[PDB]
């Protein structure tokens, strides 16, 4: 039997780990940028560091449903970026948390030491997000969020894992010469990731 990247157990485990990381990061971003009230969040522990978990079931299901669709792309190494876009009540993007991701074309079949230093890497990103409010201006009241996914290069509507996706428009993904705030860029044998924020200027 001939295997493709997605058939590798290691590719599936990494996809699981990264999808969970994105879930933790999305919850944290919503908390620190106050997209949802502090009242719905509860402090929990992840990667041995404090994080904030939404306790609103509907929001939690929405985030899981969304990220569950990114998992297969991660296994196939077809995801370039996952972006959390915060928009004001006028539907204008005010902040964009950009997670650029690159993965090797293959992973070892010798699964040993796969996630060796992964937690230290993910922890670094969470810590940066945790204090991002110190380098960003306060967002206006009534903001909402959307998640954008950029894939590796025909239907306008795509249904993945029973969840519908559509092409985003420059009407909600355009910022004229925005301020770029680097947060963290790290590399490892299984992943290279770069997180930065684009802020409306």
């Amino acid at each position: 039997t001939t295997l493709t990247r997605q058939d590798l157990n290691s590719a599936q485990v990494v996809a699981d780990v990264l999808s969970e990381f994105l879930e933790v990061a999305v919850h944290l971003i919503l908390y620190v940028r106050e997209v949802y009230p502090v009242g719905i969040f509860q402090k929990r522990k992840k990667y041995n560091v404090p994080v904030q978990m939404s306790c609103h079931p509907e929001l939690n299901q929405y985030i899981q449903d969304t990220l569950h669709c990114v998992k297969p792309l991660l296994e196939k190494n077809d995801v370039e970026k996952v972006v959390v876009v915060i928009l004001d009540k006028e539907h204008r993007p005010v902040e964009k948390f950009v997670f650029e991701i690159t993965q090797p074309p293959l992973l070892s079949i010798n699964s040993d030491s796969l996630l060796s230093h992964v937690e230290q890497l993910l922890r670094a990103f969470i810590l940066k997000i945790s204090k991002v409010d110190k380098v960003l201006d306060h967002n206006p009241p009534g903001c909402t969020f959307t998640v954008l996914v950029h894939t590796r290069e025909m239907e306008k509507i795509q249904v993945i894992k029973d969840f519908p996706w559509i092409l985003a428009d420059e009407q909600d993904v355009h910022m004229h010469d925005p301020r770029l705030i680097p947060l963290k860029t790290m590399t490892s044998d299984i992943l290279k990731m770069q997180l930065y924020v684009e802020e409306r200027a």
């Binding site: 509907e58 370039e80 972006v83 954008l148 590796r152 519908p164 996706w165």
Partner: peptide
């Protein structure tokens, strides 16, 4: 790159939003 792609379903508001299919 392909996309960007976004969920057709908008993020839920604190309390369910209004009826507007289109």
């Amino acid at each position: 790159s392909s996309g960007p792609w976004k969920p057709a379903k908008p993020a839920p508001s604190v309390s369910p939003g209004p009826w507007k299919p289109i």
